[model samples]
Target: ATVHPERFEPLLERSVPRIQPGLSAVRELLTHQPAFDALERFSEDLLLCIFQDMGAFQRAGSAESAATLRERLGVAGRFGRLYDSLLAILEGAGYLRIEGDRLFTSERVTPKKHEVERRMQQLADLPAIAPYVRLLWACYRRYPELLRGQVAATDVLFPQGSMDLMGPLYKGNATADHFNELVIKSLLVFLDARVPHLREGEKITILEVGAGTGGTTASVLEALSSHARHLEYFYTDISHAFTRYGKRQYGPRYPFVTFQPLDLEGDVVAQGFSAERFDVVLGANVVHATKNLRSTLQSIKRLLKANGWLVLNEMTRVVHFLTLSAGLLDGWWLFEDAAERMKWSPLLSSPMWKGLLEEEGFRRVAPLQHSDGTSSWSIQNVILAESDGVSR
Candidate 1:
């Protein structure tokens, strides 16, 4: 359906004052002779409307609402300009608009469907707390967090429903096993070729920073079993609940593997590990949860031995208007408390992560593609960095 501009004129006029301060700076910049040259490329009003729309979308969560509000301002065709620009930006950024009404988000931040359902059932089973669980999940799903900094420092807790809905996307039976086998084999070959002196019993130490329910850990361990004689596994998470759950589920099956609580934001190595103890530091869908990502990486750097590897598998996507707007709005609507909403959001972009890693001295090695041949929502990468500047 098409939206008419007239309906939002009053809302736009009212919002102009709220937006005017930020725009004034832009206006001042445009007034200068040198800056004015850049203005020639686009209409000043169009730019202003775009900026206004972005601000509103980031805060309010619905362009339609913003558009409706703008219609009341008597700004003829401004909403149309803003809407078109917003859509174009989103499309250019890799958002998949499946149908006219529903947009299919890139699977960068989705949890597995069964995991989500299992969590939902857990929440539902909780007496008196179930409603809040439902509310939190609904809000989190509606507004996916977009940036790493946005979710950092906040507790990475979510309603079980959040996992249930998205869990299926991450559920990997045999196909996932096959893919994991390929990665393990490739890694073994690389290690054998490069470090032939490495013996099987020497232990290829692996530490997973956020080992949620240990599913990813199980998958990796199951794959590593083929090369079991060569590795020792260490699993960690900020949440004691998750750690406890993981231990309960996997501890008996793999007696050699150990699970512990290691907050990525806090003193990770000091809590349990010595400096430069591990041969490899592995994290799956975990780095995005860290607040001070650089500090966390520095900690990991200190934990790894010289010439050790860091493996990360995660989701990455470009920003889109609908996702941005919905996330911002849902945060406000579901969480009257700003701190709580901020704690649960997961909206980080790929460029933000890549820059953070580069700044931390990580050199990219290879990208792990999912078996489905779809997108790299399950994209994995191996990075190598020297500890103490020593080459082993």
Candidate 2:
């Protein structure tokens, strides 16, 4: 059964327009236009190529039990998660068929290496969505080498210590920038409603978990200017490089911010973080990487002050294109809370997210979207929830 985010319609109709920092900007990227459609087609080509590279295509004419297929492809070991996601995406894309325990490839002919490369390279000219296309191409280009264990996915995404290939995926591009704009708007709306009631000298505390690349952080921090004097922002991530970079990039400008390494999956008190100390917590494209959502939500619940707000800018829908790129990483398939995920992918549909947040003691879990529901189909969604409203 599939979950529709229609339940969140009332929430979106009421909340989204009010938080409009750039409503049109978000809508502009919302429509699935030509370049994005090309990327989706390219993803199909890349998925087929990955199968070809793995020698799975060689056995295509005959059906093979998935277990044997997994064994034959040598993905039963470390790459098992990637294998699962790949098949799921392929089946969903109608490129493969799964009957009981066996799998069969479609009649569509697989494109050659140069053909796929030429098609992908042509996308580079479409500047609006080129960066992420190039990013996925970089992954697909070396996927065979990666499968051979000669190169790491990290090195592919961040070659030569430059985020040039990966940075644009999170920022710069219209889609990426649009989501960040929504985050900024969501945060500002929360602050606008909450700030006035603050007691004298009582600061507003915020914790941002897994603030990767400082993409949203840059925009968020800039938006917090009016509340700067009363703000105590904790910019935390599991990656030291991000924290170090954030400290350097944002620390000097905003003395109210503290950059640190914090792992939501681990004991925060052990990491020197106080319990229930924050008025607001934000996680942008991070929580899905955790091994378990229930535990992570519990940890988040533990950190929020009574009635505090939790804003999450997440990839709620599983876009098949990401399987070629992000799916290669262990983090994309890391969810241990099977009930919380979509089964085929680590992401939760917006309705499931709302249900889980409420079950975990968060209230008013509104998945913000435009009144016209234009933003609904977009992969990025901003979910806003209020804490249980009692001290721990």
Candidate 3:
């Protein structure tokens, strides 16, 4: 039996997770008793959250004022930030057009896997990764106050779930897609041009930190197979599990790859890590989470030969800021120091990074461009901040 079939008040109250993000008063609500109209509540609550937080409102498909729709949804807030994410959902699911700032409907907004996937692909950063929006959608429902920003992140709020979600979220379904391959290839070309002055047969030594499950490394290796000279790939991550995983995937396929331990936040010179030891320092989807990014960048500067490059993929979109501010994804990407926030910016936003890279002793800061003139993700940005000093 499915238990009681009426709306359960206590259950709804119980499904709420703590709002704190920095320190842990984390009350887990991942699992909860069924409450009637729970799905409907989440849909409405999501809309309400967006309406209040991001100024989201909509006009009817047939013929009604957005004001009437707001009136129908009933008075909630003033001064809307009605952005495209809502329309993204609809347009993603079904391509709708506006004649007079109103959505055109055709019973197409109904949730269907094919339609949803199609929606996420066009609207989401990576279409392959778009299906995971439901992951955060459900999470938001379970934790109404989750995005309060009090607690930066907690396992209770952001669960370490299955490889199914984790693998895809990390990088899957979108491997070597047109935009992704373009970005990787262009990075290879851009950096390869930098390698011209190297000795006749000298190999370029590449060191990547936080390689996780090895998508980018594999991506790079594939591109570098026909490289003029061999590349010494050193795949690194602080986590032994990730390192071990990298070895399992890349060790045999690319025997030139050497797995090593790296502390992006720690002292590399003191730990037998040389200054300018690497021709290129790679950190794909890493480096935004350092306890002190200035120190982190300075340390990376020391690790590179003045001509060497330091690179990684990053997100730099306001939509990301909105979704992340609404409590989506990993904790590492969202932490903004008081100074950066005072400037009203996230540290990892593209423009801020260029400034920060220049500020922290890196020069020739260039962004890797993609094929479609967009990004792998909405903005899976790759930055090359080269050193003025030469590598050994």
Q: What is candidate 2's lDDT per residue for 59-176, written digit by digit as tens?
A: 3455668888876665536677677777776777766788877788776645446777788778888877798778887887788767555687889988887887888788787777
TM-scores, all models, native as reference: 0.49, 0.87, 0.57
> Candidate 3: how many backbone clashes?
14
Each candidate: RMSD: 20.8, 5.5, 18.5
Query: Considering summed lDDT, which 10 consecutive residues are worst modelled in model 1?
Result: 1-10
lDDT of 3 by residue, 42-93 (tens): 3333443443332332222444345454444343332122223444333443
Q: What global local distance difference test value does model 3 have?
A: 0.50
lDDT of each: 0.45, 0.75, 0.50
The positional error of residue 196 in candidate 1, measured at the CA in angstroms, is 5.0
Worst 10 residues of 3 by lDDT: 19-28
RMSD of 1: 20.8
Which candidate has the highest lDDT of all?
2
What TM-score would you give candidate 3 relative to the actual structure?
0.57
Once fitted onto the true fold, the runs of candidate 1 whose alpha carbons sit more than 4 angstroms away are 1-166, 173-196, 199-201, 319-356, 364-392
Q: Model 3, residue 328: displacement in angstroms?
A: 6.3
Q: Which stretches of candidate 3 lie over 4 Å from their true place?
A: 1-129, 141-161, 170-179, 190-201, 227-229, 270-272, 318-336, 341-346, 368-380, 390-392
